[PDB]
Design a protein around this ligand. Structure first.
Ligand SMILES: [Zn+2]
Ligand SMILES: [Zn+2]
Ligand SMILES: [Zn+2]
Ligand SMILES: [Zn+2]
Ligand SMILES: [Zn+2]
Ligand SMILES: [Zn+2]
Ligand SMILES: [Zn+2]
Ligand SMILES: [Zn+2]
Ligand SMILES: [Zn+2]
Lengths: 165, 165
């Protein structure tokens, strides 16, 4: 959770510590041998910005790495077989483990717009992303489910307002 | 014409694999902002004319792309009246109304806000495509649900998320 500062300056390839989506685009550990993911980097980068600083700065040279460890192990303790690869069943109890209770028809039809797989099964690339796609959209949904029944009823205007959040 | 497009195809197809990669098409495409054409859209426009699940395009399918890419360019120009090379809020209002959309005023803000990858007060060409695409899909889905044709739908959790593309 706390890793001093050390190299709070030379974090970027150039002088200043103004690292972001465009700069830390290809710096993380992926699982497909292609560059990790622009949209995945961005929702990680948008986790600690005191005043939209675009990177790490006073006492904020700490939280960027901590979110990786809390998910590096989380990918390991749920892979089950330990291969960096998630089967169909290896995600069923992986998601539901951190408090979800999705049914079976969800882990099936997803591999096109947000994903990038070519062999059916999802790797570490879309794992980190796929969850943030999921967790954020639950929090939206919940706010409108004032009844608390898992059944919202929006009109068209609202239906739009919401998927374009 | 037919002979024209065969040369263009030979030109864009760099490796000459016989298939346009989603990178090679990306390179072919401009939107006049010195930023690389939105890959998310290059991805869309391939998974839209590709028949062989090969995530690419042959001459036979390219003929369709080029006609796609063109019909949009005209729409884009038609509506960019202030000739900025981009579509401001009000030009979008005129543009979408043109496809017989019936949307509010605030919503065009939400859409632009969401799709202006550049952060420019307006939307460029490559993101106008995605923005109109995603709006089309969403509206269809909404319509498929609205059985009694109210303008309201009623959906469950997951049902909600499973409508995200
Ligand atoms: Zn596995
Ligand atoms: Zn409800
Ligand atoms: Zn209710
Ligand atoms: Zn090629
Ligand atoms: Zn003009
Ligand atoms: Zn304009
Ligand atoms: Zn304008
Ligand atoms: Zn209805
Ligand atoms: Zn009704």
């Amino acid at each position: 959770q706390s890793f001093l500062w050390n190299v709070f300056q030379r974090v970027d390839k150039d002088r200043s510590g103004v690292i972001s989506d465009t700069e830390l685009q290809q710096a993380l550990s992926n699982g497909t041998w292609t560059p990790f993911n622009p949209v995945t980097v961005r929702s990680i980068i948008s986790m600690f910005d005191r005043e939209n600083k675009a990177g790490v700065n006073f006492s904020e040279f700490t939280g960027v790495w901590k979110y990786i460890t809390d998910w590096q192990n989380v990918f390991r303790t749920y892979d089950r077989d330990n291969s960096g690869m998630i089967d169909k069943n290896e995600l069923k109890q992986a998601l539901s483990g951190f408090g979800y209770r999705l049914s079976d028809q969800f882990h099936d039809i997803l591999i096109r717009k947000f994903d990038r797989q070519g062999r059916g099964q999802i790797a570490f690339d879309d794992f980190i992303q796929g969850c943030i796609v999921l967790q954020r959209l639950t929090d939206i949904f919940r706010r409108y489910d004032t009844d608390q029944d898992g059944w919202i009823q929006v009109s068209y205007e609202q239906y739009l307002s919401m998927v374009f959040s």
